């Protein structure tokens, strides 16, 4: 078994704009998630090959990672903070399909987790 390509994260084709949306995203929550005492395993897309797991790709048909959704915003990837938080919800929700509740992997995302949706509480009024 392979890993798959990790996911695309610049298109020059896709119109790019700068918001105080996406900007808190990138300097206030993916900075915050990324200094989290269990944002490690996070912060790349899981290696399957590495810890042999052939099944995840089987399972997880949209994989994500912070260090996709960094390269995302630091490209213009999104229009929409939509988008983002989008992906950060992929990312927690991909865990807890893949391991059984209560696993030190689960209990990681958990804390991301309620860390992140700290953050989005206070997203910013757009601008
Ligand atoms: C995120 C995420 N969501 O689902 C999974 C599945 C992951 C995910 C993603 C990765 C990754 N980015 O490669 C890694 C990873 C990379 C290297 C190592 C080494 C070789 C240093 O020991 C262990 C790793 N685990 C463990 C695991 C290994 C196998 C099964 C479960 C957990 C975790 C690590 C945290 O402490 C609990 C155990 C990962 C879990």
Redesign the pocket.
Known sequence: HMNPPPPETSNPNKPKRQTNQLQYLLRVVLKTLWKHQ?A?????????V??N?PD?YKIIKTPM?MGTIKKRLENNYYWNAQECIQDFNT?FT??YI??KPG???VL??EALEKLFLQKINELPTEE
Do not use: E, G, R
């Not at 490690?40 to 399957?48: G, L, R, T």
């Open positions: 269990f490690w395993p996070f912060q790349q897309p899981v290696d399957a590495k810890l797991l995840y990672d990312m991909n865990c893949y391991n696993d030190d992997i990681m995302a």
